[PDB]
């Protein structure tokens, strides 16, 4: 795979939905091998990476732990913008300078 996990951290997901979103993303990263590349991005009125990785990194134990620990730190605030978040997602899957 080459996933890109687009979390929606906007206002309306606060509360339970955010607990479920961060558990779901943890268990989505758990289904990734070392041949699969992943990167978690989150959007609320503008999209940004949840972690330090700015591209698709490999889904090995260390990178997956960094992504999980970033995801669990995520917080809900602001209006949702699907266009600005999907621009980010589609642009990060066209980045061929990195190993993929």
């Amino acid at each position: 795979k080459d996933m890109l996990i687009l979390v929606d951290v906007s206002g309306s997901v606060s509360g339970l939905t955010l607990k479920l979103i961060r558990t779901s993303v943890s268990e989505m990263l758990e289904t990734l091998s070392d041949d699969d590349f992943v990167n978690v991005a989150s959007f609320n009125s503008n999209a940004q990476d949840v972690s330090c990785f700015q591209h698709l990194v490999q889904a090995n134990v260390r990178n997956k732990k960094v992504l999980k620990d970033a995801v669990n730190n995520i917080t809900a605030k602001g209006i949702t913008d699907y266009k600005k978040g999907f621009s980010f997602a589609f642009e990060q899957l066209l980045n061929y300078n990195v190993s993929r």
Partner: protein, 70 residues
Amino acid sequence: NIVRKYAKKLIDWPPFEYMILATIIANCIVLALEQHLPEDDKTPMSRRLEKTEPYFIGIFCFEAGIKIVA
């Protein structure tokens, strides 16, 4: 500021009280349609409606104006 020849007191009359009665109903409907989202989030419809408050404010300050000058 007690200027007579109002001509606005005759506007307080049959039809312009049945239009205010309708602007209030429209306003109550608009306040009914709104949805409050948890943290600064806004539905598309609430952003759509937040662009009518100036109309209602205009009509209501107009009512204050005409009643006060009349």
